[PDB]
Nucleic acid binder design. Structure first.
Ligand SMILES: [Mg+2]
Ligand SMILES: [Mg+2]
Ligand SMILES: [Mg+2]
Ligand SMILES: [Mg+2]
Ligand SMILES: [Mg+2]
Ligand SMILES: [Mg+2]
Ligand SMILES: [Mg+2]
Ligand SMILES: [Mg+2]
Ligand SMILES: [Mg+2]
Ligand SMILES: [Mg+2]
Ligand SMILES: [Mg+2]
Ligand SMILES: [Mg+2]
Length: 55
RNA sequence: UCAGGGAACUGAAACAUCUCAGUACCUGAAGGAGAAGAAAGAGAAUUCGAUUCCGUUAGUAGCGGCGAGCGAACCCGGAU
RNA sequence: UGUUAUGGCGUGCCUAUUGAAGCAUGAGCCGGCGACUUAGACCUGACGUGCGAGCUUAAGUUGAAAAACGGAGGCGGAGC
RNA sequence: AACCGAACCUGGAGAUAGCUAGUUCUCCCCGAAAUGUAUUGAGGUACAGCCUCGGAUGUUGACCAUGUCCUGUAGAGCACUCACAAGGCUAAAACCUUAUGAAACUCCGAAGGGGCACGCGUUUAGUCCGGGAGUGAGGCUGCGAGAGCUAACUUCCGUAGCCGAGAGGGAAACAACCCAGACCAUCAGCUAAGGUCCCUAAAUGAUCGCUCAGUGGUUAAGGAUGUGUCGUCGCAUAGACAGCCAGGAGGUUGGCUUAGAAGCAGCCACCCUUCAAAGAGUGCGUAAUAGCUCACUGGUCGAGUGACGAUGCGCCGAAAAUGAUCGGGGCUCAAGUGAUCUACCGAAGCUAUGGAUUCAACUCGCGAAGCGAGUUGUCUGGUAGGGGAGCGUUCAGUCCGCGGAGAAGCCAUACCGGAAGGAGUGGUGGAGCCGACUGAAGUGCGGAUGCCGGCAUGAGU
RNA sequence: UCCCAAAAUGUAACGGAGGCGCCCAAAGGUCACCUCAAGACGGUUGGAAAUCGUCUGUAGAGCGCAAAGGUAGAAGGUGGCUUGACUGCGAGACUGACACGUCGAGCAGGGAGGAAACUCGGGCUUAGUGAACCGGUGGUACCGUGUGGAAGGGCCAUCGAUCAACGGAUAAAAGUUACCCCGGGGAUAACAGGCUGAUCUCCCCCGAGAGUCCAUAUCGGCGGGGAGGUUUGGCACCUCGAUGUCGGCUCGUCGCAUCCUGGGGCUGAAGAAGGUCCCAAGGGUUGGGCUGUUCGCCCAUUAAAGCGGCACGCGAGCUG
RNA sequence: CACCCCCGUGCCCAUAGCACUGUGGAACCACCCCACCCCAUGCCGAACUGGGUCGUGAAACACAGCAGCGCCAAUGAUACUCGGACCGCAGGGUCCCGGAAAAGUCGGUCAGCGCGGGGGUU
C-alpha cells in the first residue's frame, strides 16, 4: 500500500487522530510507502476515508 | 516609666470560652530615666547565690470549646 | 517624505463572560501621582559559592576613612 | 446645628470585606479547567483529575492486529411476571387454537465495548520522585436517554466534535455548522469546503430528462381529467366510449311500516313473464302521486375507451401588524432541478524561494560540562498558569571619558536592532553628563464612577 | 435494591418504584437426615383452600424483613452435640480524593462437631450505620516534675451521639423590619423584549346527525390536520454602576381573521328585511350614567357605533 | 478392545430427556423374608439397619426398538449495528462499507468416551 494524507485531522475523533499520528503523518499532503501487514492494513482501513490509498 | 480603671472591630471561615488584650483609650504619680533589687529565691548539682538588659535554651515544657490559637523557666554565653 | 482621489477589505479599548460592536461596566482630553512589598538566627525547594563527615556562629568585644575576636547555641551523626 | 430606627470629632483603624473594581516593559517554549468527592457547601474552600518546570527511568505510552475472557443494550421473543385481541371450551380461573405490548419481562441476543498477552507491526509517549500553578459558572451541534406538550437558543446525564483559549475560506450578515489549525517575508503555484449570468474570482459549460409554477426563493391533514414514467384490471371492427333519434317493460302503490311513503325516510328479499330489450332498481322531486333520466336494447359514425395502483416535478389548502425582496440585480431562448463528465476560481491548507526560532543527533573551538557558532531534521494558534532570554528608569561602587566653540531636558527626522528599545544630524537650552561591569530598587501604566493640576464640550447657549 | 445507565466499571434530575436505623441463642458452629408450589382423582366434622392418600412435579416454593442476583447434589426443611457471634496476626487483592469500607490463603495459642477428609475467627449475599473531642466501667502497671508512694495521666477492652440538615462550625440559641442600612447579582424573580405554544384566538379535513323530507341554506357529535402569536404560562437569553409600572388624556400609524359603507356566489333568496361564504381596508366608526379601571352593564342615538399590533404604542408629552 | 454381557465409578453433564413397546434372571441387581435386640422412622424397621432362602422379573433396574413430545438445530433473506455519507420542521428515515441476530424452515439425533471388579463363549 501507498499512503497520502488528503483530509484534515480536525473535527475528527481521537482514534483516527492517533492512527494518523502512528501511521506517521504530519500535514495533509504528506505520504509514505506502507507495509502490507495486518496491523498496518488496519492502520490504513481504520482511517481509510482520510487517506488516498494508492494501490 | 509605674500605677489605678480598661474596650470592641477582628480570629475562631457563624458563636457564647477563648482570641484581638490587658493592646487602644481615660486617670494618678515621677524622673532623666524609670521600674526592680540584696532570697521565707531559683534548681535537682546535697548547684547557683540581689535587680535589670541582649543571646540562647524553644516555639522545647506546658496551656487550649486540648479548637482557633497562646507559650515559659533552669542551665550556658554577654552588658553590667 | 507629506498630502490626496478611487478601489478592496474592515463590528472602538478594557472588564466581566457560555457568549461583547455591543442598547452590558468603566472612562471628557492631556500631564504628572498611582498597586504583589518589607520582616523575622522562621519552614520548604531550585540555582550558585565555601568548607566537607563534618558545617556554623548569636549576644557582645575590641578595632573601624577597614574587620578580626567571640562556640553559650544550632544542624549532620540511629532508629523504633 | 441644612440627610438620626441611634448626633458630631478624634482615636482602636491600612476593622473585616469568602464581594466588586484596578493590577503598569519585550520576544520565545508548553499550556489547562469549567469534572469527582466532601463541605452551614453550593459565584467560596480541601483532595484528586487536567498544566508546567527539574530530576529519574528510559520504552512500559499511541494506534492497529491476532488470541482469550467478561458484559446483555439494539434487535427479538413470549417459554416466566404484568398487561392484551378473535374463538373454543367449561358449572369465571388454568387448558387449547389464532393474536399481541413491555424502563423496571426474558427462551434468545449482535454491532460495539472492556480487561489481559504478544507484537508478527507503524508510532511516539508513559511512569516515579520533587518545586510552581490555575481551574471546581461552561456553550452549541450530532447520536443515546430521562425530565417537558418526541415545546423551548428548556433542563439533567452518556458520548464525539468544535467555541471557550482558534485567526483563514465558505454558509448575505452570523462562536459552535462545513473545509481547515495562522514561525516571519513574496504582485509566485496546486487544491478543500463552496462555487464559475452582472454586483465579486472561475464554463450563460456538455449530454439525456423534469416543472411553468416563479415552483426554485416560509408546513400539514386533505383536494384535484396539471404534466413525466412504470404496473392492474377492463371492456370491446365478428364495429364498443362519449354524443344523437327512439324505447323502457307487464305482476307490483313487490311484502313489510306507517297518518300515509307506490324503483328513491326505515325492515325483508330482489323472483316470475315477454323479449332485442327493459333491474322490484341510480338521483332529483311530492304530503304519497305523479313527472324527469339511468342500468338493458337498435340504427348513424368509425377510432379506441374506461377505472385503480405507484412514483418523479408541480397547484390549492398558505392571514399580522413601519416599506418591499431568492443577499440584489435578474433568471424558464434555466442564472431552476434529477443524473453524468470535464475545465477554472477558490484559505493564511499543500507547494516554491529566502530567513528566525524549538528540541534532537552530527563538528569543532576550549583544561573542564557549559556555552558559542556551523549542518541536517524537527518544531513554532493560543486564555488562566508554569519555564526561558532580554529592553528601560533611578540610586551606588569601579573603568573610560565628555562638556560654555556648550551637559541634562525639550523639539524634528526617510537610520539601526528580532522586541522592549538605540544612534546620527539639526533646532532649543544653559549647566552638569553618556557608555561598560557590578550592586540596590518608591523601577515601566489607558483603564480602578482612581488622585492632584491644567484645558476642552455643551456655546456664546 | 431495582429501572433510568446507552450489554465492563462509573454516570444527573424536586426522573420512575421500594425497603433499613432491625432481628436470631440460636434464624449460629458442626454432624446426620428430609425436600418444595401446585393441579387431578378419591376420601370424615370437612365441603372454597385447608387434614390424609395416590399420580403428575426444575421447583411454577422456600429463604426472618425491600428488591435483585443466587440456591434442591441446598443457602430450603428437622434433630445431636457446641462454642470460632475466639485471641495473637495477616501474604494478596477489590474500592475510595482522603478518611473509611470489603473479600481473604496461610501461621500460632487454645478449643467445637465429625469415624474421618475436613469444616469453624456469626447468620446466601448485598441495608440494620456515626470521626474526633469530653466522660463512664473492668483490666494493665508504661509516666508520675527531690526520692518512695499516692492523685492524676497512658495502654487494653468497653459503655454514652436521630450530632438523620446522618464527613457532624458551640457545652449552650427563635422571630420581625414597609424605619431600614452596606457589599454584590441580570449568576436568579416582578415589567417589556426573546425563544416556545400546553393554554388562548382563528382556519381546514370527516360527516353521525339536527334541518317536515334533504348531511353541507344554515348548524355539526366523535376524532383529526394547520395557522396566529394579541391570553395565562413554560424557559430565564440582554438589562439589577436603573429598559419607570396599571388606567386616562394627546398624538398617531399599521395588519386583517371587515363593524359600516362598495362588488359578488349560494340561501331553505317572492318583494321588503335577513343569513352565509368570496373579494375588498378608501374613508368612517357618536354623546352620556356607574367604576382608577382596562373590560362590562345600562341611557339616548347611529350606516356603523370592528378586532388586534406598534416596549399590553405614546410620563426627557401631561395626568397620577 | 479376543466376543459379550453384568456391577461399581468417571468424563460428559437433554442432538446424551420422556413416554409408548419388547428383551433379561436364578452370574450380577432388585423386589421378597424375618428381624428381640446393634442403629433407626417426630407414627410406621415403609426409610435408614441387622440376618437370609425360596419365588419372581411383575415393580425398580439394564438393554434394545421407536422419534408422538421434548432438546439440538442449518442455509437463504431479514432485524439491528462499528465506520463512512446524507435526508425530513419534527415523529422518523436513507445510501455505501464491514459485522451480523433472534424466531422460523432444512435437517439432526433417544449419545459418545474411560477406569476397575464379576460372570460367561459345554
Ligand atoms: Mg453590572
Ligand atoms: Mg479600609
Ligand atoms: Mg404529520
Ligand atoms: Mg486615566
Ligand atoms: Mg412591574
Ligand atoms: Mg417576561
Ligand atoms: Mg353585501
Ligand atoms: Mg418616553
Ligand atoms: Mg430453539
Ligand atoms: Mg467499516
Ligand atoms: Mg452510521
Ligand atoms: Mg449491510
Amino acid at each position: 500500500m501507498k499512503i497520502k494524507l488528503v483530509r484534515s485531522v480536525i473535527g475528527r475523533p481521537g482514534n483516527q487522530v492517533k492512527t494518523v499520528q502512528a501511521l506517521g503523518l504530519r500535514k495533509i499532503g504528506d505520504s509514505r510507502e506502507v507495509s502490507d501487514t495486518p496491523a498496518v492494513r488496519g492502520m490504513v482501513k481504520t482511517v481509510k476515508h482520510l487517506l488516498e490509498v494508492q494501490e
